[PDB]
Amino acid sequence: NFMLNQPHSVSESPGKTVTISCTRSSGNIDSNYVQWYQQRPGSAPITVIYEDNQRPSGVPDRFAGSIDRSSNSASLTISGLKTEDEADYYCQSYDARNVVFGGGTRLTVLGQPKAAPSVTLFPPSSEELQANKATLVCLISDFYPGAVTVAWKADSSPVKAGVETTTPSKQSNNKYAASSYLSLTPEQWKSHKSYSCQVTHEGSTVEKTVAPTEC
């Protein structure tokens, strides 16, 4: 066997250049092709470089593979660093008797801008009420940093039972989303004037309110 050795983590601001190295422990780096893979948390990996320095279509030209024979290493160079480049990066080569991966490098993009959540509150449907259940959901999307706290109200009073809120996950736009859901009986839903979801993010609060409908 041989090993591919990568730094554990690198941290840089947007717009800068980052270099991630991949040093072969034994045998020459050039005796087999080196691939690079990018993996965002929550997603499968993608190929960003194959055959040392070839870029698949759709991969931005900011990504460049190279080989340095004197340091017995391969490098992935990302110029013009963007928020979307925050990921784990893995180099990969062959032992002939095996496919071998580097240990992975976490690339942190520092200084991502703050983004307030979009908050949308949905009442229980007819169909759900007809099945003798009542759930409210408060959708909280497109926010950064990825921490919120949620409070529910029945009329103006705090609800302290039947609340769950999901752990925030980064979505395809590189911001977080979550939902808070409140489980009620149909009778609870109908015996109040309204329910409200109040979302606090970075010290600012957003409130939405829904009421039982009338035809």
Ligand X SMILES: CCN(CC)c1ccc2c(C)cc(=O)oc2c1
Contact set with a copy of itself (CB under 8 A): 1, 35, 37, 39, 41-47, 50, 56-57, 88, 90, 97-104, 120-123, 125-128, 133, 135, 137, 139, 141, 164, 166-167, 169-172, 177-179, 181, 208, 210, 213-215
Is 137 near ligand X (CB under 6 A)? no
Please, what is the minimum distance in Å from the beta carbon of residue 156 to ligand X?
A: 28
Is 7 near ligand X (CB under 6 A)? no
Residue number with CB closer to ligand X (15 or 41): 41
- Which residues, 6 or more positions from 43, have their beta carbon under 8 angstroms from its beta carbon? none
Q: What is the DSSP letter of 83?
A: G
Checking 29-34 for CB contacts under 8 A at 24+ apart, the result is 29/67, 29/68, 29/69, 29/72, 29/73, 29/74, 29/93, 30/67, 30/69, 32/93, 32/94, 32/96, 33/93, 33/94, 34/65, 34/67, 34/74, 34/91, 34/92, 34/93
Site string for ligand X, 34-73 (x = CB under 6 A): ---x-x----xxxx--------------------------
What residue 178 binds from a copy of itself, ligand X, none (CB within 5 to 8 A, per partner kind)? Answer: a copy of itself
Residues that bind ligand X (CB under 6 A): 37, 39, 44-47, 90, 101
